[PDB]
Ligand binder design. Structure first.
Ligand SMILES: Cc1cc2nc3c(=O)[nH]c(=O)nc-3n(C[C@H](O)[C@H](O)[C@H](O)COP(=O)(O)O)c2cc1C
Ligand SMILES: O=[N+]([O-])C1=CCCCC1
Length: 362
């Protein structure tokens, strides 16, 4: 077994390879998109993870696409996150913040000024996001057709990522994870299906990857490359965003470019919840030869699959999502070969302590 052995992840040393995947839970305070002490407790309970990767967190108000998702742009958000990271550190944990801009997976009612959300192109996501009703409960709503960003708006987006990383470093996070997956803004630019631009940010794969690589360079310069991770979902379809007709080649291009920056990690979300074709071993080998940081695999993993791929020298760590919702001490359970708590999906999104901080340890 290698799952319970340490791993250097950029500037941080994880004591094991069992990571907590980023999990949107939609329990922040509105107004202000403010993290809470309840969220702090939840993270503290999971501090034995080799690395906790937070719920996706807004870089800006414009970045918001879900009612109840937290931000990391305001003073009050910074102050609330500082308490949360301090609590994780008091338990000897490590925590990365996942930073997103939701782009077109959003709704005008939760945008600044009530305006249409932004994207690479003016194309509806054709999916749903989560708002809150008059009683504060999560509800699904169809996404609003976005406005295509103007060329002169792009530097501001890059700056918003940079600024949120300054704020994250201040707030006590150990690492940042850029959310370049699952059909959010960065992935909207990467995918030819969502990006129909004919300027320097669309068309060729170099142009489609331009924004994400400008963001990577800005955030490495703000902090350090060894503090930056990135999540990608570059093979298959995620929330109605496919990866185009040359998905493997285009993925390898991006990964070779990322490798040049010497970033801490590449986190590959391999499948959505409905599943699909596994990554080929050949593809995993191509990724591994091109990237010289930590590789984290995710998506309906088992401990056995993680051990197998780590043993094969293809990945370094695994991120578990749903099993971490339900098992605060997932590390101990996997180490001991104990049963896993029963999941309660009705309380994944929104609400309070129930289905959030009430899953027991062994
Ligand atoms: C409730 C819920 C919230 C999620 N939130 C995020 C998120 O904030 N960021 C992200 O990149 N993926 C998110 N995902 C995907 C998970 O990180 C993970 O990739 C997915 O659940 C598949 O892994 P699993 O089989 O271990 O659960 C979410 C998944 C679920 C079930
Ligand atoms: O950011 N994400 O990937 C998700 C957020 C909430 C819905 C599930 C996917």
């Amino acid at each position: 077994e290698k799952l319970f052995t340490p791993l250097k992840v950029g500037a941080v040393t994880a004591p094991n390879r069992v990571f907590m995947a980023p999990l949107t839970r939609l329990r922040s305070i509105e107004p202000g998109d403010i993290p809470t002490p309840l969220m702090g407790e939840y993270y503290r309970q999971r501090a034995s993870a080799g690395l906790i990767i937070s719920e996706a967190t807004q870089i800006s108000a414009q970045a918001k696409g879900y009612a109840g998702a937290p931000g990391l742009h305001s003073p009050e958000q910074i102050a609330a996150w500082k308490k949360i990271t301090a609590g994780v550190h008091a338990e000897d944990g490590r925590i990365a913040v996942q930073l997103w801009h939701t782009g077109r997976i959003s709704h005008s009612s939760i945008q600044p000024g009530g305006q249409a959300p932004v994207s690479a192109s003016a194309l509806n996501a054709n999916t749903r996001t989560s708002l809150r009703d008059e009683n504060g409960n999560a509800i699904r709503v169809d996404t609003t057709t976005p406005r295509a960003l103007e060329l002169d708006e792009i530097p501001g987006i890059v700056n918003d990522f940079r600024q949120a990383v300054a704020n994250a470093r201040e707030a006590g996070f150990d690492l940042v994870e850029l959310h370049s997956a699952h059909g959010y803004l960065l992935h909207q630019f990467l995918s030819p299906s969502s990006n129909q631009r004919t300027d320097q940010y669309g068309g060729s794969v170099e142009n489609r990857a331009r924004l994400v690589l400008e963001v990577v360079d800005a955030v490495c310069n703000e902090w350090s490359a060894d503090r930056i991770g990135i999540r990608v979902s570059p093979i298959g379809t995620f929330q109605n965003v496919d990866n185009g007709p040359n998905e493997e080649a285009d993925a390898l291009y991006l990964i070779e470019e990322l490798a040049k920056r010497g970033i801490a990690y590449l986190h590959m979300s391999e499948t959505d919840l409905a599943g699909g074709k596994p990554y080929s071993e050949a593809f995993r080998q191509k990724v591994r030869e091109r990237f010289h940081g930590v590789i984290i695999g995710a998506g309906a993993y088992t401990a056995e699959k993680a051990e197998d791929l780590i043993g094969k020298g293809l990945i370094d760590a695994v991120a578990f999502g749903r099993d971490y919702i339900a098992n605060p001490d997932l590390v101990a359970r996997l180490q001991k070969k104990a049963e896993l708590n029963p999941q309660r999906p009705e309380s994944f999104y929104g609400g309070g302590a129930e289905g959030y901080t009430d899953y027991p340890s062994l």
